[PDB]
Each structure stands twice: as structure tokens, then as C-alpha cells.
Amino acid sequence: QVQLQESGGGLVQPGGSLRLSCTASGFSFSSYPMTWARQAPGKGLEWVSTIASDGGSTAYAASVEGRFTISRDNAKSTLYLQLNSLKTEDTAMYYCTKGYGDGTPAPGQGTQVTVSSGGGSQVQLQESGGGSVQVGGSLRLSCATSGDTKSIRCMGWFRQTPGKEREGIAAIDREGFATYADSVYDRFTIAQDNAQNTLYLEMNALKPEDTAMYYCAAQNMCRVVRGAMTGVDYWGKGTQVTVSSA
């Protein structure tokens, strides 16, 4: 049974960003193309974007081309829509469907996106990609920035393990200049895709000492010493990374 559930909608101002998720169950999600469509008050269901089963092909409506990006994580049976540079006319209920745009959402589906000058000015950060890996292994963390993200000048990563002080480990500006804590240098890489409102932490050569809750952080004015941000304005809720040997 095909079961889809959208999330990540909300209220932003023009020029803001949102990241929609659609979690799939009850079918081989990775075998099928998937689609986002949207319905604005008193209008028909409009096709927005389609992505191939394997993620390697995409298509977009002319009205969103260059602003929205479809993606998927087949290991997590989840479909995403990154909504950058939001406009008032992007306001709609957004729906995920199996296939190419001929599918109809089931009752109960939908996440509301509202783009309004009357929305608040707020930033939200959300990490993902934590897991349990072996010593010497690799992991990639992501951080989605949503809301009024235009003010951000620098982003970075912190970590904290039970019993120890939080540690700032890497930071980066919009031009891509980065610094690192000595503890992670030449093992971890921070990268971004600010066109896509995403920050990454590529983690290689993992050690047990790397086991920690990892958090992303942002600020409106860059203040960093050796990878460690001070004067942090915004921060996420955390993703756990556990490095062990069995």
C-alpha cells in the first residue's frame, strides 16, 4: 500500500527558504519516480517537479526552475523539495505522489507553504545524517537552513559528548573560506551549497573520540577562531554520531 506523508511546510517571508520532506512506506520507493505538485487556493493541482527512481534525472515547472531543487534519499525512503527564493505566488498546499504527476494525493496528505510579508523573520537549522559507524569509517552530515536565511554570513559545526564541553570544529563563509579545529583538520571537510541553503560536514577517518552529538550553527557576523564560532545566532537540534568497533 502506497503511503506518503509530507512535512516541513511553514510560514516565511518572500525571499525565504523551506525544505519539504515526504516519507514513503508500503512500497519499493527506490523503484519509482516521484513527484511534487501544489494546490493554491481556488486553483487546480499544479505539477512542480519529478525525480527519477535513482535520483539521476529531474524536471521542473518553468515557474520554479532555478529556485526549487528535488532530491531523494533512497536509503531513508524519503523525497525532498528544497524551496529557495520563495515568492508570494508559491503559497499552496504541497503534495508528494508516486510517478510523474498523474498520481492523486490520498486524503490526509499535504504540507502548507505560506509566503507572506506578514510572516515572521526567523531562521531554523536542522541537522541530519548521523549514524553508527566503525573506526576508520566515513559519514556525511547535512544541515538545512530555513526561514529568512539571507542575513547569514557564516555557518559551522559544533559537537558535544556527555561529560565534556561543547567544541566548535569547523566554520565557513559564503565565499567558501573555512577554518578547522586542529582535532578534525585533514579528516573532516566543511562545505556548503548556499544556493541550496545546505551546509555539509564530510567526516573521514573517524575515531572513537569523534562520538558526539553534532550541531550546526549560523551567525550574521563572522567570528571564528580556528574553526570555533563565537557569537552564534542560530543553531540546530543535533544529530548523533557514534564511532565504535564491535
Numbering used by the authors: 1 to 246
Paper text:
Two SCAs of interest, one with higher potency (DR638) and a second with lower potency (DR736), are highlighted in the screen. To further characterize their activity, pSTAT5 signaling was measured as a function of their concentration and compared to wild-type human IL-2, confirming that these two hits offer unique levels of IL-2 agonism. The DR638 IL-2 SCA adopts a conformation that is similar to DR3097 in that the VHHs are positioned adjacent to each other in an antiparallel orientation, but in this case adopting an inverted V-shape conformation, possibly due to the linker comprising 4 residues instead of 10. As a result, VHH–VHH interactions cluster predominantly in the form of many hydrogen bonds at the top of the V-shape, resulting in a lower total BSA of 861 Å2. Similarly to DR3097, the DR638 C-terminal VHH CDRs are close to the VHH interface and involve a CDR residue (G147) in the interface hydrogen–bond network. We inserted 16, 24, 32, and 48 residue-long rigid helix linkers into the IL-2 SCA DR638, thus enforcing distances between the VHHs ranging from 24 to 72 Å. Compared to a 4-residue flexible linker, STAT5 phosphorylation induced by these molecules was progressively reduced as the inter-VHH distance was increased, thus confirming VHH proximity can be engineered to tune SCA activity. Similarly, in our IL-2 system, the use of static helix linkers derived from Myosin VI to enforce spatial separation between VHHs also allows for tunability, where increased separation also led to reduced activity.
Results: We describe crystal structures of four unique bispecific VHHs that engage and activate the cytokine receptor pairs IL-18Rα/IL-18Rβ and IL-2Rβ/IL-2Rγ. Interestingly, comparison of the four structures by overlaying the N-terminal VHH shows that, while the C-terminal VHHs of each SCA cluster on the same face of the N-terminal VHH, they adopt four different inter-VHH interactions.
